[PDB]
Amino acid sequence: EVQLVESGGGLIQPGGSLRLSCAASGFTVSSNYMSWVRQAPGKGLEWVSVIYPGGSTFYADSVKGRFTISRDNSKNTLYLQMNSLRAEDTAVYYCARETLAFDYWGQGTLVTVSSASTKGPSVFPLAPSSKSTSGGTAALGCLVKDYFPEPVTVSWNSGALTSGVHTFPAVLQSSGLYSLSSVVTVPSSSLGTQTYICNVNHKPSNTKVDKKVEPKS
Amino acid sequence: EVQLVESGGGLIQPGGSLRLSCAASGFTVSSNYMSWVRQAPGKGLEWVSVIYPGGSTFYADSVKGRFTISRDNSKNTLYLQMNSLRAEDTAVYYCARETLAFDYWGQGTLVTVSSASTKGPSVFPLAPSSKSTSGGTAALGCLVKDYFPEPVTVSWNSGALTSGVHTFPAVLQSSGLYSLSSVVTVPSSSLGTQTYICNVNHKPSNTKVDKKVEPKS
Amino acid sequence: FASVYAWNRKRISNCVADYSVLYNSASFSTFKCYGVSPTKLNDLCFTNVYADSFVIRGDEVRQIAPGQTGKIADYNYKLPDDFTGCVIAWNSNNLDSKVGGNYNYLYRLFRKSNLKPFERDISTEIYQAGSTPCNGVEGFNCYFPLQSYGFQPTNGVGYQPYRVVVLSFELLHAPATVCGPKKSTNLVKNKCVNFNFNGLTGTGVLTESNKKFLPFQQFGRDIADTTDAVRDPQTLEILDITPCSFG
Amino acid sequence: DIQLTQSPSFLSASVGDRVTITCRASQGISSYLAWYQQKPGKAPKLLIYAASTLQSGVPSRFSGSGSGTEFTLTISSLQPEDFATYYCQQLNSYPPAFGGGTKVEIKRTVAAPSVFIFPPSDEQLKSGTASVVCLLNNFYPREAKVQWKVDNALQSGNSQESVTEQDSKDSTYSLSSTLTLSKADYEKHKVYACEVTHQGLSSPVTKSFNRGEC
Ligand SMILES: *[C@@H]1O[C@H](CO)[C@@H](O[C@@H]2O[C@H](CO)[C@@H](O)[C@H](O)[C@H]2NC(C)=O)[C@H](O)[C@H]1NC(C)=O
């Protein structure tokens, strides 16, 4: 029925600001209790703000002031204009339609680091090899490293292969940049035979690169 | 005499904003009727705003409010600070010095899409071949595809060849990204003989790549 | 009439002004009053009335008002921000527009700085635009500052000529001046009445007299100083004033 | 009420001739407007002043005819180099109304296209997609047909064309049609052909290659 989608997340420094748009895909945001739910990664949730069908605010404890919610019924959009982020909110933001309980609440991210790198990948193909080969199957993958802007994605063959494709959690180095590697197993009879191209997309930047993985020379 | 140049166009989403600087290359923007003329692609022109030598605004009909013009005489710059673009203005912007009529008006672009890809080219060389060869001449070119940020340019040999060089209008695919191909004919005695390197530059991004086109293997 | 860039300026002075013949003439397409609503004009008195006259387009009559902008109000004719008078305007297509174009009605379209209110500028210097000294020569970086309405009888409304008159009532610090016309009924006699003789307010019976004032004396007084005779301003006859009966 | 000006667009002529373009004015305007020359992908340039007093820096081919309403421009003795649109305006009044624009074509005669087919580059087949370009070079009648065939099957709905502006030197057109396939589907067929139909060809020309033959 109702499929709330949100947009507006990115990266900024303290004293910054940012408008978030809970785009009410779905109906009647004019007459519903709406709210913002926040969670830092590795942590439990937390509640931020709420609008009444009639207009009231009641902000949370720590984000009392410095933080503004509103709606637009004719556009079916909720608007969250924040500013002066203590950078201590670096969190994953959700907007949910409270219907006597909650439920129906999309997703959307944000990070408020005191820097900017915004660079993108460093992609290498990890070739299928006999040291990875065992009997009927052999594994190959793509290593995408050294990027700050956390949300990054790597698909296999434009989203074709869903068998054996496993992207591992990104790792945060001492350099301050993330890195990850996604690997997929495929029958050892099919080392080079078919197409295995990893599609790397970096959404905070605009990086899009396809890398083919082939057995070692 | 007067050679008005403008800068500031790019890509943004609704509720965004943007300052445009009609850089008065040429003299005396302190005492001249200046204005902004707008046209959507495939459409006729439209008038936006105007400054008087003495200061007055008179904005247009649909862009009444939400849109601000000013000048700076000591810098010889006109300033157009807009905001909250309904994205329905995605247009090609001109600033012209009204001298009892008009004339003397440079050019400058803008797009206000509700997304961002900003990626850049995917360049391939289309080799000269006997299927393209006929008698005294043969054609070769460069295919630059899959980019969102509309203004893109491909030159031949850093701007050397102007004979037969013809860049065809970019095409907008269902994927939402543009694509084009620029081709040039050259005597068939000169298939590989001289240099034919297409210089691809993507100005919204910072992509610059030179690709050589040679006959098929 | 007079151009828009050199408007005229008539200084109406001591007289009897009847703004009713104006207000109700129904021939005016625009009659706005700002300091004072129109019907109360024939009941007030000022020191001076000025009347400014000129000719503009049809759709520039909305810049003749306090606090506007545009090529007319910026530098042709500027109204102060606490205006007091009234603005009157009527269409004049048949008088001022002539086939082939009436190119005798000019306006100024370039000036260094907007006018002060009620300021006037009839100079004709070349509007030097380009840093390059114009040297009094046309060409580039130098425009002639006056343009001309080419009025033609087949112009849509809003491009036909309108004539405008701006009345501005001012009150310096004199002793008095022009005011609206007064009235009077029918001087009755032999009845206890409540009378006013150009300032003399009283009560009593009025009767035909047989005294003779000197031909500059208005009313007569008794010993113990009470008004007992008057002279009627219109017919100039002496009338005694006796009190009506008490006891 | 704003003025709505109109124009009888889409002109077509030959060189050295007379052509005449009118501009309606759907209200009583006086006699102050202006014409512009808009070459494609460029900035306008005004030719006719606020009536007919053609602004300087222009040749002697334009003759603006003014009136109360129904203004009219006329080009006599054309020259191959005026490929653009012509607009009306309306000086004086602040918010001004613009025209609708008249593109003007330039007749030629008969000139068939050079045809050329390009197979997909090896770099692209790595990426997983195949563009097959077919080029039609120089040609007057633009009413050309590009039929793609794959193994002799007429291909519908996976191509895109674009065409250039009429050339300022030789008054010809050039056309590029791109056929887009997946690597997988590309590798399922052999002959890729591009069959061009055109008035300067007595029977259609096919340029073709065979996938995988150096
Ligand atoms: C004021 O006006 C009245 C008329 O409005 C004058 O009355 C006239 O008086 C003369 C006497 O010399 C008569 O012959 C006229 O017939 C009168 N006119 C009317 C209409 O009755 C009166 O004289 C004026 N006041 C003064 C001081 O002259």
Author numbering:
A (entry chain J), B (entry chain H): 1 to 217
C (entry chain A): 347 to 593
D (entry chain K): 1 to 214
Task: Give passages from the manuscript.
RBD, which directly binds to ACE2 receptor, is a major target for development of the therapeutic nAbs against COVID-19. The prefusion structure of S protein exhibits more dynamic conformational changes in S1 region, especially in RBD, which has two distinctive conformations, “up” and “down”.10,11 Only the “up” conformation of RBD can bind to the ACE2 receptor. To further explore the interactions between nAbs and S proteins, we solved cryo-electron microscopy (cryo-EM) structures of the S protein in complex with ten nAbs, in full-length IgG-form or in both IgG-form and Fab-form. Bivalent binding was revealed for the full-length form nAbs, which showed that the full-length form exhibits different binding mode and induces more RBDs to the “up” conformation than the Fab-form that is monovalent.
The structures are labeled according to the number of RBD bound with nAb as mono (1 RBD), double (2 RBDs) or triple (3 RBDs) binding, respectively. In the S/P5A-1B8(IgG) complex, two or three RBDs are in “up” conformation and bound with nAb, whereas only two RBDs are in “up” conformation and bound with nAb in the S/P5A-1B8(Fab) complex. Next, we compared the S/P5A-1B8(IgG) complex containing two “up” RBDs with the S/P5A-1B8(Fab) complex. The structural comparison showed that the two cryo-EM densities corresponding to the nAb in the S/P5A-1B8(IgG) complex are closer to each other than that in the S/P5A-1B8(Fab) complex. When the variable region of one of the Fab regions of the S/P5A-1B8(IgG) complex is superimposed with that of the S/P5A-1B8(Fab) complex, the constant region and other Fab undergo 5.4° and 18.3° rotation, respectively, whereas the interface remains unchanged. The 2D class averages showed extra density near nAb of the S/P5A-1B8(IgG) complex, which might correspond to the Fc region of the P5A-1B8 and was absent in the 2D class averages of the S/P5A-1B8(Fab) complex. Additionally, the Fab regions of an intact antibody molecule can be docked into the cryo-EM map of the S/P5A-1B8(IgG) complex. The IgG of P5A-1B8 triggered S1 shedding most potently, resulting in about 80% shedding after incubating with cells for 120 min. The neutralizing activity measured by IC50 showed that the IgG-form was about 450- and 900-fold higher than that of Fab-form for P5A-1B8 (0.08 nM for IgG, 36.25 nM for Fab) and P5A-1B9 (0.01 nM for IgG, 9.12 nM for Fab). The first group, including P2B-1A10, P5A-3A1, P5A-1B8, P5A-2G9, P5A-1B6, P2B-1A1 and P5A-2G7, has the largest overlap between the epitope and the ACE2-binding site on the RBD.
